[PDB]
């Protein structure tokens, strides 16, 4: 949370570093829904999306959370759906995470795209097996 506290906001949650906080997957996905980006961070406890659009003051006031940790407790059952055509589109797909919510991630790394969906498919996979 120390190396993450400088990329979150209100560090939501009641002590996670003790419950886990083991960032399963570390990566930043863009939300193709209004030119918006956020540093995604699926924790072994839940999913946390660190919003990222602009900066904020109070930098010299001990801080550096340019982003904003967004509560996303669905990793326990996600559903990524790489619904894109790059060749025809940019580089984003639909993400169907628990709590019935669809997103529009935007990756630029063939690996990230795979690690983006693989990571999600990793947990979502534990929602029936393992």
UniProtKB/Swiss-Prot annotation:
Residues 23-127 form the PH domain. Expressed in gingival tissues. Interacts (via C-terminus) with GRB2 (via SH3 domain). Forms a complex with phosphorylated MUC1 and GRB2 (via its SH3 domains). Interacts with phosphorylated LAT2. Interacts with NCK1 and NCK2. Part of a complex consisting of ABI1, EPS8 and SOS1. It is linked to Fibromatosis, gingival, 1: A form of hereditary gingival fibromatosis, a rare condition characterized by a slow, progressive overgrowth of the gingiva. The excess gingival tissue can cover part of or the entire crown, and can result in diastemas, teeth displacement, or retention of primary or impacted teeth. GINGF1 is usually transmitted as an autosomal dominant trait, although sporadic cases are common. Promotes the exchange of Ras-bound GDP by GTP. Probably by promoting Ras activation, regulates phosphorylation of MAP kinase MAPK3/ERK1 in response to EGF. Catalytic component of a trimeric complex that participates in transduction of signals from Ras to Rac by promoting the Rac-specific guanine nucleotide exchange factor (GEF) activity. This is Son of sevenless homolog 1. It comes from Homo sapiens (Human).
